[PDB]
Structure 1
Amino acid sequence: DSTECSNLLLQYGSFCTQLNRALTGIAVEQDKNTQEVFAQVKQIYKTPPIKDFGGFNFSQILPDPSKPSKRSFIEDLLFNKVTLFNGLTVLPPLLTDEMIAQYTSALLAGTITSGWTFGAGAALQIPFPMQMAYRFNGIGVTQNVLYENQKLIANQFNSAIGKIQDSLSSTP
């Protein structure tokens, strides 16, 4: 707020408009990047109240009704671990943390309920064991391998998720 600066800058040119346009374009680009990454679907799927996934446990990555900003425990650890005038201002993002978390919840519900069918159109319900059998067939392993070791594979997946949360809790 000095008039002499304005007097000496009006004759200097229009660099301020250039910088403002560049910053506005950058901010719009980041909003578009988040929008493209997280909003892969236009329908917010919800996990059914009953959770019978053949022994697989997803309560670790699914949201809980305790209201921790509608985020899973792993998401809570991720948020907690990350630690964050003179004409400088910070524009808030268009998509809030709750909105991104609900997109993530919808993606999880669609993946664990409909497999990959919801990504190609309408969501198609299918038991999680049969979805895993399809995925096993994708990598060239027959379905009977899954079906005769379902408990072992479920336990291995649960243990792997446990090691993931243990690493995210203590290991920096």
Structure 2
Amino acid sequence: VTTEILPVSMTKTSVDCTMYICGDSTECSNLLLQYGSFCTQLNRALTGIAVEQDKNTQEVFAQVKQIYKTPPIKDFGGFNFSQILPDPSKPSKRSFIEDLLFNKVLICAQKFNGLTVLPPLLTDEMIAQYTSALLAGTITSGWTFGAGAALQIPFAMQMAYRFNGIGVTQNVLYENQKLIANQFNSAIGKIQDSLSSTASALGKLQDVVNQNAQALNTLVKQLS
């Protein structure tokens, strides 16, 4: 099991050009009009980015028409998913692995200069619901949910198809079904421990956060 981490969205900042340049000043604001539309097009450019960030999120996660759910009885042929499926004992219905990702990866001082941050259209809880649906579909219907109605299929049979896909016959899976389930379950446990241990594992997402934080701090410091 390999973990691949990709940025999807960026913080939706919004900077009020007039407030930033001429905060609370009529004399400055009037001089700023001599520069025509510069503020209008700057406000427009940032607005366009903010809209794009909601679009980016929607295109990555909202690929499922229905919110699929797994059955109460999680019999998947020996394959354990408790680490990646939601655990409803807590208010946010995230998985164990997701909590690790979330725990791993000033605002007033910035805001006060006309620098606000707009909330995402899709909240973390909604992203979790989409991933749960995608995951529930993947587990109970294999890939059929991605091309129409989800078929139900036994997980072991789904794996058999996936083995055929890679050029390995079906009997290899069935003959080794217990081993394969153990290797899988072990690999998932390794991900859990790797994420709990290595802080730098999510550097790709943290770097995006850091670049934007620096950009705002630089912008605010220029007022001095």
TM-score by length of 1: 0.97
Distance 2:120 2:106 in 1: 18
Higher relative contact order (CA 8 A, sep 6+): 2
Distance 1:137 1:19 in 2: 54
Q: Which runs of 4+ in 1 moved over 2 A?
A: none
**1:130 Cα shift?**
0.2
CA offsets per residue over residues 43-88 of structure 1, 9 Å max, x none?
Answer: 0000100011010000110001212511000000000011991010
**1:10 Cα shift?**
1.4
The RMSD of aligned alpha carbons is: 1.4
**1:13 Cα shift?**
1.1
Secondary structure at the residue paired with 1:45? strand
**1:11 Cα shift?**
1.9
**Residue 83 to residue 156, structure 1, CA distance change in 2 (3 Å):** farther
CA offsets per residue over residues 122-146 of structure 1, 9 Å max, x none?
Answer: 0000000000000000000000000
Partner of 1:3: 26
**1:7 Cα shift?**
1.5
**Residue 71 to residue 155, structure 1, CA distance change in 2 (3 Å):** same
Secondary structure at the residue paired with 2:32? helix
Distance 1:97 1:65 in 2: 15
Secondary structure at the residue paired with 1:11? helix
Unpaired runs of 5+ residues, structure 2, are 1-23, 199-224
TM-score by length of 2: 0.75
Secondary structure at the residue paired with 2:51? helix
Partner of 1:39: 62
Secondary structure at the residue paired with 2:69? coil
CA offsets per residue over residues 8-49 of structure 1, 9 Å max, x none?
Answer: 011221100000100000000110000000000110000100
Distance 1:42 1:144 in 2: 34
Select the structure that is richer in strand. 2
Secondary structure at the residue paired with 2:86? coil
Q: Which moved more, 1:13-22 or 1:80-89?
A: 80-89
Secondary structure at the residue paired with 1:90? strand
Identity of aligned residues (%): 98
Number of residue pairs the alignment of both structures matches: 171
**Residue 68 to residue 159, structure 1, CA distance change in 2 (3 Å):** farther
Q: Which moved more, 1:28-37 or 1:77-86?
A: 77-86
Distance 1:88 1:63 in 2: 36
Partner of 1:107: 134
Unpaired runs of 5+ residues, structure 1, are none
Secondary structure at the residue paired with 1:53? coil
